[PDB]
Design an enzyme around this catalytic site. Sequence first.
Site, mmCIF file in Angstrom:
data_model
loop_
_atom_site.group_PDB
_atom_site.id
_atom_site.type_symbol
_atom_site.label_atom_id
_atom_site.label_comp_id
_atom_site.label_asym_id
_atom_site.label_seq_id
_atom_site.Cartn_x
_atom_site.Cartn_y
_atom_site.Cartn_z
ATOM 1 N N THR A 131 0.828 -1.210 0.000
ATOM 2 C CA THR A 131 0.000 0.000 0.000
ATOM 3 C C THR A 131 0.865 1.264 0.000
ATOM 4 O O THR A 131 0.421 2.321 -0.447
ATOM 5 C CB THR A 131 -0.970 -0.027 1.203
ATOM 6 N N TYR B 159 4.604 -12.819 4.564
ATOM 7 C CA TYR B 159 3.492 -12.163 3.891
ATOM 8 C C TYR B 159 3.151 -12.918 2.606
ATOM 9 O O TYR B 159 3.957 -12.989 1.679
ATOM 10 C CB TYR B 159 3.842 -10.686 3.663
ATOM 11 N N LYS C 289 1.364 -12.421 7.663
ATOM 12 C CA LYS C 289 0.281 -11.640 7.082
ATOM 13 C C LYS C 289 -0.332 -12.514 5.989
ATOM 14 O O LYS C 289 0.286 -12.728 4.940
ATOM 15 C CB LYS C 289 0.806 -10.324 6.488
ATOM 16 N N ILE D 231 -3.268 -6.431 9.153
ATOM 17 C CA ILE D 231 -2.502 -5.373 8.500
ATOM 18 C C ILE D 231 -3.396 -4.827 7.391
ATOM 19 O O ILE D 231 -3.655 -5.507 6.402
ATOM 20 C CB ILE D 231 -1.135 -5.884 8.006
#
Lengths: 292, 292, 292, 292
Positions: free
Chosen positions: C45, C133, C161, C203
């Site tokens: 992001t 992740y 994540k 997250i």
Amino acid sequence: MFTGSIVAIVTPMDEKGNVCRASLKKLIDYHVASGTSAIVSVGTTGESATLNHDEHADVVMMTLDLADGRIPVIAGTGANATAEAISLTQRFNDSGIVGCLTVTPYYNRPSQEGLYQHFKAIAEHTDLPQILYNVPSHTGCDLLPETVGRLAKVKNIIGIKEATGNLTRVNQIKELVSDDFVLLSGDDASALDFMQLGGHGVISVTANVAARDMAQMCKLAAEGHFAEARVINQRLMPLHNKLFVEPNPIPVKWACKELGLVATDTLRLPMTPITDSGRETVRAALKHAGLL
Amino acid sequence: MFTGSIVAIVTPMDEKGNVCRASLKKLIDYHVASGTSAIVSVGTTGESATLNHDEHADVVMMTLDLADGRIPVIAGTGANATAEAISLTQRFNDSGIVGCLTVTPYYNRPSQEGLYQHFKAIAEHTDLPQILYNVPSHTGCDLLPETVGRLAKVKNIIGIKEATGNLTRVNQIKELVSDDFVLLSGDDASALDFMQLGGHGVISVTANVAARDMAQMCKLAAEGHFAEARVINQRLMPLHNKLFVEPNPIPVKWACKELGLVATDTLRLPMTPITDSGRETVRAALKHAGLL
Amino acid sequence: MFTGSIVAIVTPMDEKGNVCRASLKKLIDYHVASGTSAIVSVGTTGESATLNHDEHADVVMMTLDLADGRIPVIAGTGANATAEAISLTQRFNDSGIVGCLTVTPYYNRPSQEGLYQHFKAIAEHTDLPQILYNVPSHTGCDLLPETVGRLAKVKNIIGIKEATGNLTRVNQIKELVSDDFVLLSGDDASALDFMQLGGHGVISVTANVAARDMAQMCKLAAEGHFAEARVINQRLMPLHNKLFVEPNPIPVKWACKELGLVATDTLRLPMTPITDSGRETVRAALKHAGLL
Amino acid sequence: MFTGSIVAIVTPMDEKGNVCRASLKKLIDYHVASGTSAIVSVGTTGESATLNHDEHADVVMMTLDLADGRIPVIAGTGANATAEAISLTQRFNDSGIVGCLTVTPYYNRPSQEGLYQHFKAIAEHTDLPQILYNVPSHTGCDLLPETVGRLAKVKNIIGIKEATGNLTRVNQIKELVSDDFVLLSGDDASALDFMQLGGHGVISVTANVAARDMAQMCKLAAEGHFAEARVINQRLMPLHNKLFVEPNPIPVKWACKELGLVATDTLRLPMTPITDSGRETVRAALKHAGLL
Ligand SMILES: [K+]
Ligand SMILES: [K+]
Ligand SMILES: [K+]
Ligand SMILES: [K+]
């Protein structure tokens, strides 16, 4: 009746492919003894596809008789033609079954409006409680939460068997329906998760051969004892998976025979006998569950 | 005839959902005049799902009668129970049809061995040519090239309607089968590509409303004139796609009504009437094709 | 620090595409005020893809400074080359960050053994806690539970994540790792479900513009008050979905500007400015959440 | 040259993971002698992911030097940040390469408008011919025919490596672009089908070890001799599939070592050595191809 561990029971057959009454009695006694909450008669696992409607009805009526009021019986009533679904449903009106399990039309892939009109019409021709059944990998269509919410407004449409394995559906449906609308898993490997998210039980293939464990697992889940339930689930997980190593119900019928619950593992074409590799795979999963 | 443009014909209905003989006659005259190679009667597009076997048989017999020897008729004979498929096939022995279109069992998801035994058994108990039919998005199962290869060795299993839209299947199948085994597209949008790779024709929904163009396109393709064929395909492409904007045969029946080919666009539940948005989409596709 | 609502913070830019220090300060103050548990700096992001390693490090160091010990900062450290991931990680050794968020190598699609060797090597070159992740829709690969369990044995690999949106992963991973291994959702729309299944937080992209609500939702979830949390989730669900109406972080950067949290919604190519349709879509989701 | 058999060449490494000049020389001599049309240097198969821009540039320059005008060289120049893609392209201006192969940005998933602006900007700031490269299973995004059509209007965007394996893309793209826009397969297993539908060649992994056969197959395809080409393709098909049994380029580097074309089969992490099972699979494919 529409919560806890519900068995999607096999239709035990003799070598000729006809229902074996002695084996069915043995299975039903086993589920009564095991604490199974209800029986689904002639669903997918019961070979609804290869039984004609007369044979289908005979099996349901026989199961009802053998159950002898000791355990509730839900009839499979799904069909991909609405008129046909109505006709089949009407056979069990005033029969003694407590409800119907009716699948989204398969093969002809109706719209969400078509699914709505299909189930609404069916519900209007019966006083029997209706449990919707969504299983896109078998049917080619997907009854979405929005349409479930819409159908849940119909009086005798009272729950859903959700067999996508997509756990996001639980709370998507739940927020769109009233608090007494029943949410049941149709996917053994994700059923405990389904219940942890707020599901009310499972219509189960695994329960055919691990009825006591399954009943115990769903009790713990209902009471919020999920860690304790996971111990059982972990013991059963290889069956949750390997009972689909070959097409359902080929593995579970073999498992029944192996545990001495049915006389033969005979099926109707296009279902074929389990392979040697399948046997050993299923045998190992039974061993892991502590059943063999 | 099992090459060129073959129409998966609609079963035109009056407002009560019953077969309309007068509309059916019109459609058949239209296909005789438009150079269509053959008619598939009561396939998927003919609403095989919502007709009972008596009605199914009636439509085929009516189609044969009306055709009056001017165009070959192929009967849809598929079923998800082998016994049912066999007995449905027996209804058409010495009826005058030239062959059967038989789908992979839907909903019960047999293994490759199960599919082999299914089609082998069907082929055993008839002299009629059998065309296999694969459409995984509708059935939940996928008849793979290897198994098509095994089945092609059966004398009267003569071809396949391949409706995956996966064009790699053309030559995967072709290398496993004899030179006279027929490869037919069941996906209108990719059917010209399919033929360019070696396919022999198409069993088509688009041909219901664009019969002449489809006949010409398929002939050009057979002659190897792909550029010329592709100009026609480009005009037809919106129709190829938008005839599935809502579930088949909802869009194509509406299109037939709009062209004046049938009296009503009525279907049986769980098919529902076309939406207004659908009307506009399909109408624009018809105009792009130069039909309105 | 590694539980509750963690923001995957945008990298606010000026019209020239360089980090805007005033906007970043405003955002960090907002998260401190809002009760956000931690900041992930230069994750997906935060446009890790279009920042070079020097710029990446400047942004992390600036965020650390601006945070001024008031909120923990986790640096994005992922790379599809292991040597490159090590180098980037080494930049933040002895920096003040509390841990690293490191994605499965994208584009080159390593095996499960390759993923194991990749993350193991990275962990061996740092004392910093490592959060795995997994996001297959972006990377082209899928770090499976078995490999997560294997990596969780490494001392400073402390959580994951999980951004598949596949909720079955929660308990598949949980049973393979120790009780203090952290399970975080990387999928806003399914994050509450994820937590209800035993997840420890999220997250979040949504947290960029609804930090207070998100923090409140995760608190309720941690305390087992899921019905209360769902009220918030329902208010936020349109943002959970519509913040990906166009590619992340195009929508969330526009939302920040609209709420006055950042000066400009500028991004780096190949990210492009939000469409008019996207604006109205996101504006409506902000309105639904009661933020506009 | 942008037609026929183009090799996506491996970057051969010593045991320290550094480029092996002697092995590279051998490979280039091999391709000159085997009729390969051109070499793609530092594409996906050349481990573009784990080489830095300096090393990347060195390999290309070394490849040009060794080729010594005997075979055209195309440089991989793709990046997920437009600025990076542009500056990487500038490294090769007046280097002697004939064109660039530039992939859709991976990992950040730009919109179609973003992809348009990305490639337009790259093409703007060079005179070098640009070949677009679509491979959604690796990148997480899909450059659709419509956008290829827009981009083909840019003077020096001259072609596309289409690696979806979706053969419908050939004519969807072809109808939107000019007759001299080049259509190249990036999927070895479907590359002959791709060419039969109108494609002009292949950028191939298989060509690394079966250069002569690939050159001949592609020439036959261009001449329209598809049956003759397909006999070669059948021998090569196991290789087409099994060169991806483990992540590319693990299998093809091992195959090159086994044939004596390179000194070691060393890769950089996160690529790991081939498994024993992989050795056996690939070796059997090489023998099927008549190479061992
Ligand atoms: K109700
Ligand atoms: K045959
Ligand atoms: K650990
Ligand atoms: K051009």
